[model samples]
Target: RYDNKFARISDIDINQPESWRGRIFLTFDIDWAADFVLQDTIDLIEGAGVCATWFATHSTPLLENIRRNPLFELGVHPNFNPLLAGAHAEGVQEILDRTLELAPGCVSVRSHSLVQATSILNMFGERRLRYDCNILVPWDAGIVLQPWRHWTGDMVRVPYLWEDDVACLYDWEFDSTFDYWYQPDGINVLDFHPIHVYMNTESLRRYEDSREVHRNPVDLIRWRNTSAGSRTFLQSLLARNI
Candidate 1:
């Protein structure tokens, strides 16, 4: 039922009779995760049979796998940090062009590190990408979120409220019984990373400890935190009857 909702946030009819009391969205950042790491999340989401949006960061066989799944929406996750630091050879336009090529029909993007600029917004408009999700307001703020037109009038800006990494940083509980999950009259968007879900990370230190072996599934498995974590939280959410 929510499948169409992921297609375009800007077109949402919030005042319509069918509008959910509390609109919820799940989004994932690929973050150059290893095949197995990313696959773990795919399996979980597929089993839940829920709609999700993915911000892809690189080209891989799994991209095809994700594209094949009708329940998943693909978007670009371009890294502009290096460019801002003067360490990248490619210009912003080239970077956008290259990433968009990875997902030919993609119309949404959430730049890596949440970087955005007036020029990039113009470029996005030129490229026909319809949505940009670069702003994140912490859920603890208890603010209501909604999609609105960008100043360029070329795309909708969807602001997410929570993210797995930020949750870990703030020591949020891993259980899924969060009140925001069921908040009414607002858009609740949550961001996640497959690597965090795979590791069930509980702390930033835990993630840092396993950084070097992130791409090595065997080594990464050994570092997995079994306690209630990202994986556990996601499981709890899926198990909820709502």
Candidate 2:
């Protein structure tokens, strides 16, 4: 069996985990009005005795909730909803500015839609940000193959990257299960939008009736809730060193 406690930051040896024992990392991208579901999600994860890193977009409502949950690791998810298709330096700054205003001292950021400009990364370094999750290999968008240190210079190339569930599904790709299950040695950075998970009943009804089946947000939440095999795999992975 695995130890319940995860590997501490100081003890992280990414290469060892990949070569000797299989391991995976779970990260949650908390975006939009999904603050309603956060409490429930946190409860579920807490009940299971697991900690997850939550990447926050400019969602002010859940700030307190994040702060209160010691098990939750917090980071920034740049708000790029409107500008995802074409992110510019000015637009990127706006996202960062809002995030800083709401949650000061945030050091990490994953661009909205994973659509970030080179200038944006430079700007983040200029502002003393610590990490950026924008770099990804075109072949496997969901795995962060390498760490990106924050420094001002040429655009730093990250070793690994993974696509968010929304992006994968939007592009008619297989659901996240394939990526998560097959990549034993890769870092799995799963991103989710919470507003889609816990909409009011009326909105859900409309969603159920819509022709856009894939667009239905509840399924995303359901996917995370029902993936027992994946959860078991993660638990087993953690048990190796514990």
Which candidate gets the maximum TM-score versus the true structure?
A: 1
Clashes of each: 0, 16
Task: Give the whole-model CA lDDT for all candidates, comma-separated.
Answer: 0.79, 0.48
Task: Give lDDT tens digits, candidate 2, residues 109-214.
Answer: 5666676666877877776555566654543445435343344642233333333333334342332333433344443334334433332112233334442433
Model 1 CA deviation exceeding 4 Å by range: 1-21
Residue 195 shift from truth in candidate 2, angstroms: 5.1
- Candidate 2 — which residues are off by over 4 angstroms? 1-23, 81-90, 137-144, 148-186, 195-242
TM values, all candidates: 0.90, 0.60
User: Could you give me the TM-score of model 2 versus the true structure?
Assistant: 0.60
Model 2 Cα RMSD, 1 decimal: 6.9
